[PDB]
Design a binder for this molecule. Structure first.
Ligand SMILES: *[C@@H]1O[C@H](CO)[C@@H](O[C@@H]2O[C@H](CO)[C@@H](O)[C@H](O)[C@H]2NC(C)=O)[C@H](O)[C@H]1NC(C)=O
Ligand SMILES: CC(=O)N[C@@H]1[C@@H](O)[C@H](O)[C@@H](CO)O[C@H]1O
Length: 273
């Protein structure tokens, strides 16, 4: 077994402007986002490759849960703004929570909020109790700990529920998170009217993202003039490119090299002028 992480991020705005939802939520499994929800549509929607997954989650019921989450989250923001007596201002509360497993064993958990970018309050499950960092968080803490069962529920969420949810999602996400998709490569060249000729090597449609792409000139690894990459969440694939400029009078042999975890050995793709 390897490392898997489940992370949720909530963002609330006390005075949202036109076309920006007051509350937005997203969730990621490792490097991929699997769902989103906002206060405009009010629907939890799967994303990327999870749009094709069936039976992992009942999105209609999750929608109801997120609405309840949104309500409490925004009330928390409202209370903070009230404490500072600044509702005419535009403020933001962001919360991050989730857990991780490694070798099928819980290996980490976190739950922390930030107000206007500064640490606000976080849960320490070993105590177990909330830890305030901002003066207003002392009030929030008092409310979140008004009955003995509240900290017990918070501890159970990080230690029992969240990892159970991750394990479940992993059962339906094997063909997504554990893929070893080999890269397709395409070499191409371009001539800028007046500038040198440049050779572009592109590796695409691969996963995971870790990859080694480099050009060689007569077997000599070259220094790229421009390099870049991207992750397309819709597809769950990466693309990575490298570019070199070639002397107007160079005849040497150019070849692109690609090494990736899904390949039995590296690939070489020479460029034919
Ligand atoms: C994964 O998604 C990416 C992004 O949509 C696809 O890349 C595009 O592919 C089309 C047609 O193949 C090209 O015309 C675009 O230029 C590509 N987007 C860019 C600018 O990178 C990719 O084909 C998808 N791969 C799979 C396996 O479906
Ligand atoms: C400890 C636990 O209950 N979680 C899972 C368990 O359900 C599963 O049978 C086992 C197989 O490797 O992996 C672990």
């Amino acid at each position: 077994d390897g490392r898997y992480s489940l992370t949720y991020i909530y963002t609330g705005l006390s005075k949202h402007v036109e076309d920006v939802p007051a509350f937005q939520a997203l969730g990621s499994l490792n490097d991929l986002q699997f769902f989103r929800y906002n206060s405009k549509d009010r629907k939890s929607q799967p994303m990327g490759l999870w749009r094709q997954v069936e039976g992992m989650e009942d999105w209609k019921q999750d929608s109801q849960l997120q609405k309840a989450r949104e309500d409490i989250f925004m009330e928390t923001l409202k209370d903070i703004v009230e404490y500072y007596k600044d509702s005419t201002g535009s403020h933001v509360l962001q919360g991050r929570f989730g857990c991780e497993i490694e070798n099928n064993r819980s290996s980490g958990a976190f739950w922390k909020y930030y107000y206007d970018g500064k640490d606000y309050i976080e849960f320490n499950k070993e105590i177990p109790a909330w830890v305030p960092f901002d003066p207003a968080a002392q009030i929030t803490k008092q409310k979140w700990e008004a009955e003995p069962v509240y900290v017990q529920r918070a501890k159970a969420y990080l230690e029992e529920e969240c990892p159970a949810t991750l394990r479940k999602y992993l059962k339906y996400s094997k063909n997504i998170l554990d893929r070893q998709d080999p890269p397709s490569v395409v070499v191409t060249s371009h001539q800028a009217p007046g500038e040198k000729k440049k050779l572009k090597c592109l590796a695409y449609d691969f996963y995971p993202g870790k990859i080694d792409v480099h050009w060689t000139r007569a077997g000599e690894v070259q220094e790229p003039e421009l390099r870049g990459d991207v992750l397309h969440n819709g597809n769950g694939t990466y693309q990575s490119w490298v570019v070199v400029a070639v002397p107007p009078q160079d005849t040497a042999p150019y070849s692109c090299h690609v090494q990736h975890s899904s390949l039995a050995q590296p690939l070489v793709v020479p460029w034919e002028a």
